[PDB]
Design a protein around this nucleic acid. Structure first.
Lengths: 109, 199, 175, 138, 190
RNA sequence: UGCGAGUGCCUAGUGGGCCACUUUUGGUAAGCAGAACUGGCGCUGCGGGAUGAACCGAACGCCGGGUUAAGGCGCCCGAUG
RNA sequence: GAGCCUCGGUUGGCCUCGGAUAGCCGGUCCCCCGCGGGGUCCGGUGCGGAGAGCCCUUCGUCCCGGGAAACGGGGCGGCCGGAAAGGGGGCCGCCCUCUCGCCCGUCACGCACCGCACGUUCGUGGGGAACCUGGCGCUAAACCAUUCGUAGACGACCUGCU
């Protein structure tokens, strides 16, 4: 009856300075701030939960107004708790600084 | 979920470095007591850096030119504005998440103030170096309201004294409690200290 | 010349056996280098002014790393130096206090770029010898020569700042 | 005003590094920021490790500044640092901090259940004295 | 060079009772009390010896910018000891060529007006520092006398009345006029 | 040491160049004028030097993963939080 | 009181000393001044009167026994503290209901939706439309037109007019 996902912030796309690659996303899970301790979240499912105007279907429940884009955490990023995630569809870029849910059910430990 | 940051004892750009990155991640931070930020170097140096900023006005029409803010809150608000992409829409929505105030708002008078150890004077600056408060520097640029702020901050300081005295009065009663009840909570205390509590 | 952690290398070399002298004398030098690859290259540099010898007219007989004979005993070292300035060259004699001989030369290189901006391709090291407690000509090394040492760490400024970056306690520094 | 001093024979605790969390006796001072490090009964070898990653205690054992690893071992056992360190309040809270690190979910449930009934009785007792203090106030 | 230690004892007499709140040293005795905060020197202040016989100051790992602050700590302390035991008496002699300088005190010594200086119509109202007492000496026609305990406050008031009697746009080498320091002494000589 | 080589016809466009390491003429000097070798821009996008002819790296069919050069890793801005 | 459009993040709160950094915290106060201050004394000082931290913890209900409570949970009026951009804060009971609330043990039940995801709150969330039941209280202002001329290119401004 509580929370089954970790708090994670979409900090931006994979980019240099004058280029930006939209197909890979950079994530900030609050709580992790070191390279050696990002191994737990490798391969975990990450989902960006938002809601829209029109009604859409929902598995195992009534149709509601919320939609998601499913994703997966690929590998770590620059020894600061930054970590890379790949989604099925690229982020709308309106979720920068917005919190998404990264899950634990793709677990190994 | 909203940070309240005490501005006393913090560097100008070091606290702004922590704040501006936290703002862009979508987390509201409130910087309070902005007369307490101090700047490295001797006082007569930092005065001329900001007095030469006052000379930066457009000759044809200073009314639309650079707005030289004089309050220590808006001076700290100015140095975060340059460190954020305020020309884009993401930057403009970021400045709405930043609330910066002089003194202590009654909204935040009964809130615990965070301290950033990455921006403090004692930990960042060498003890033999010189430092200049922004509150004293702002008054000599034209900020009138340091005497009003000092009287209100003195009033806020003594108002918290009774609360802290009441906090100590309740804490000794908190401490007195386990000294007459330990004969019946001695089945509940060791399970905390065999897992690393109360030691 | 770059640097890192330094190692003292004993490199010996000679000339190729020519008919007019088929047994050339064996030449031994102590070369400080990060690895043995550039120790051989620096061996041919230092020989190239003392004697009429080049790399193609010579060979490296043996290039091995000499180890510290007392890595756990504190020792005082004296280093003669010859570096290039913006103006003409100058001679230096330096003191360092370190466990190993190569560590003192490592401490010599990092101090030389700090005090005089002399980069590692400009300093030539002549001789490093064991120096006793006496015959030390700087108060900076002589100040550690006492049987009863006692000093605190007064302004113990703390680091590990960014682990938890927001806190409530103003951190103490007196320990 | 200083009580802790870097001294020949100062017992020190390592904050971070390779031998993190182990006790160190000081033999000799190398430089302004280097010292000779000896670890006889604490499973630490002899080397130099700088003053930044050590926190010094208030235990003094006497030996000359060039002890050959054996006289400092004999002084470590006759002073009996290991039992004296284990009875120190400082070492009580480092082991208590790491006891919370290994707290499994099942042990967290016992703590959570015991936290509730513990906290239910003190604040009941605190409120009992709170209204009692008002009785003698008037 | 970062020197490991730099030490100097401060021998104080038995008639002075001193205390210290960290670095804020308080010196009291016969002629009153003196408070002077010794912060921003970044040195410790150790009061050792039973019945408070000496004060000891050290500096650890310093270079020559704060080696020089070690001795000014003792030098300020001895002036506090000297200002409480024997005080500070700075006799203030007045020198004039033709027009005599008429000096007189108003409250106790606080307000000193300077008139008939070079025949100037402008009187010169100079306030002394707090705790500094001013008076006119005897057995000599014109000399001012400044009394107090703090060396900085008394001598600054002496410089205030010395710089008030300055000649403008003239030859200073010829117009040797004004009130100048005569001797730096104490209230009693013990 | 490496590369499959030789040979015959027509044939457009070009015939104002410029810059740079080094050598060097006239000129005090020039983002000046005039020479040698080599490489570039012209004809060429890309990362970097904030911006950009010629600077460093590197040359390009459309994409995914990984890794780098030169540069960098307080924020803008990816990375030493 | 129920349905019905739109907007988005959201997934427990931390209800507060000041300040020093070559120095702090909390006490009794045998002692002295006006609950506050000073001296002295006592235990920590990598802080454990620790934000490396504090409180609550929700699967639920049905019987009994053990630990806690008897002074406690919950259900309408009086009295105070708050202004720098103002707090769902404390005390008195009552005509009404408990040893249920929380900590250990017996005893069963709850679509056991048969492995498959946006589940779980702040949410009587902000804005507009109209339906509902009942109560209490309301009665205008601005602009145009005219006049004025302290004003004025035109707008605008100052005035008067049962």
């Amino acid at each position: 009856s509580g929370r089954l996902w970790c708090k994670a912030i979409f900090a931006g796309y994979k980019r240099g300075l004058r280029n930006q690659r939209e197909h890979t996303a950079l994530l900030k899970i609050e709580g992790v701030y070191a390279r050696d301790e990002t191994e737990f979240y490798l391969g975990k499912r990450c989902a960006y939960v938002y809601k829209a105007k029109n009604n859409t279907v929902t598995p195992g429940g009534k149709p509601n107004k919320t939609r998601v884009i499913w994703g997966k955490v690929t590998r770590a990023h620059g020894n600061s708790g930054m970590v890379r995630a790949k989604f099925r569809s690229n982020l709308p870029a309106k979720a920068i600084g917005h919190r998404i849910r990264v899950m634990l059910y793709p677990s190994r430990i | 979920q909203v940070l309240v940051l005490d501005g006393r004892g913090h560097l100008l750009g070091r606290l702004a470095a922590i704040v501006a990155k936290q703002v862009l991640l979508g987390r509201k931070v409130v910087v309070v007591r902005c007369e307490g930020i101090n700047i490295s170097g001797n006082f007569y140096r930092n005065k001329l850096k900001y007095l030469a900023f006052l000379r930066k006005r457009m000759n044809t029409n200073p009314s639309r030119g650079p707005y030289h803010f004089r309050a220590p809150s808006r001076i700290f608000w100015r140095t975060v504005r340059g460190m954020l992409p305020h020309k884009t829409k993401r930057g403009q929505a970021a400045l709405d998440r930043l609330k910066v105030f002089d003194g202590i708002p009654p909204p935040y008078d009964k809130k615990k103030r965070m301290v950033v150890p990455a921006a403090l004077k004692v930990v960042r600056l060498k003890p033999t170096r010189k430092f200049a408060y922004l509150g004293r520097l702002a008054h000599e640029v034209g900020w009138k309201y340091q005497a009003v702020t000092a009287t209100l901050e003195e009033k806020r300081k003594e108002k918290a004294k009774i609360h802290y005295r009441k906090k100590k009065q309740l804490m000794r009663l908190r401490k007195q409690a386990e000294k007459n009840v330990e004969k019946k909570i001695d089945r509940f205390t060791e399970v905390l200290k065999t897992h690393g509590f109360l030691v | 010349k770059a640097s890192g952690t330094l190692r003292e290398y004993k490199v010996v070399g000679r000339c190729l056996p020519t008919p007019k002298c088929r047994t050339p004398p064996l030449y031994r030098m102590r070369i400080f280098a990060p690895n043995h690859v550039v120790a051989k290259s620096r061996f041919w540099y230092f020989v190239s002014q003392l004697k009429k010898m080049k790399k193609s007219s010579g060979e490296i007989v043996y290039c091995g790393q000499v180890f510290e004979k007392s890595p756990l005993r504190v020792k005082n070292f004296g280093i003669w130096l010859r570096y290039d300035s913006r103006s003409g060259t100058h001679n230096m004699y330096r003191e360092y206090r370190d466990l190993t001989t190569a560590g003192a030369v490592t401490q010599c290189y990092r101090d030389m770029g700090a005090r005089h901006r002399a980069r590692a391709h400009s300093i030539q090291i002549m001789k490093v010898e064991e120096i006793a407690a006496s015959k030390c000509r700087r108060p900076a090394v002589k100040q550690f020569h006492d049987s009863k040492i006692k000093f605190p760490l007064p302004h113990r400024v703390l680091r590990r700042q960014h682990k938890p970056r927001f806190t409530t306690k103003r951190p103490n520094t007196f320990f | 005003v200083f009580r802790r001093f870097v001294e020949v024979g100062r017992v020190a605790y390592v904050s971070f590094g390779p031998h993190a969390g182990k006790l160190v006796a000081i033999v000799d001072v190398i430089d302004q920021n280097r010292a000779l490090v000896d670890g006889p009964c604490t499973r630490v070898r002899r080397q130099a490790m700088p003053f930044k990653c050590m926190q010094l205690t208030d235990f003094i054992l006497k030996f000359p500044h060039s002890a050959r690893q054996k006289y400092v071992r004999k002084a470590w056992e006759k002073a009996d640092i290991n039992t004296k360190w284990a009875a120190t309040r400082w070492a009580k809270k480092i082991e208590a901090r790491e006891r919370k690190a290994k707290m499994t979910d099942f042990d967290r449930y016992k703590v959570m259940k015991a936290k509730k009934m513990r906290n239910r009785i003190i604040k009941n007792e605190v409120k009992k004295l709170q209204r009692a203090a008002l009785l003698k106030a008037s | 060079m970062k020197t490991i230690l730099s030490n100097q004892t401060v021998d104080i007499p038995e008639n002075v009772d001193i205390s210290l709140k960290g670095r804020t040293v308080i010196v009291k005795g016969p002629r009153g009390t003196l408070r002077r905060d010794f912060n921003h020197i970044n040195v410790e202040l150790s009061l050792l010896g039973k019945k408070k016989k000496r004060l000891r100051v050290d500096k650890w790992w310093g270079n020559r910018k704060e080696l020089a602050t070690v001795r000014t700590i003792c030098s300020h302390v001895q002036n506090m000891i000297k200002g409480v035991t024997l005080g500070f008496r700075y006799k203030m002699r007045s020198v004039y060529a033709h027009f005599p300088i008429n000096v007189v005190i108003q409250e106790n010594g606080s307000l000193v007006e300077i008139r008939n200086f070079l025949g100037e119509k402008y009187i010169r109202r100079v306030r002394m520092r707090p705790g500094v007492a001013c008076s006119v000496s005897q057995a000599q026609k014109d000399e001012l006398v400044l009394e107090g305990n703090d060396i900085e406050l008394v001598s600054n008031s002496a410089a205030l009345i010395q710089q008030a009697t300055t000649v403008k746009n003239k030859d200073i080498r010829k117009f040797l006029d004004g009130i100048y320091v005569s001797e730096k002494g104490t209230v009693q000589q013990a």
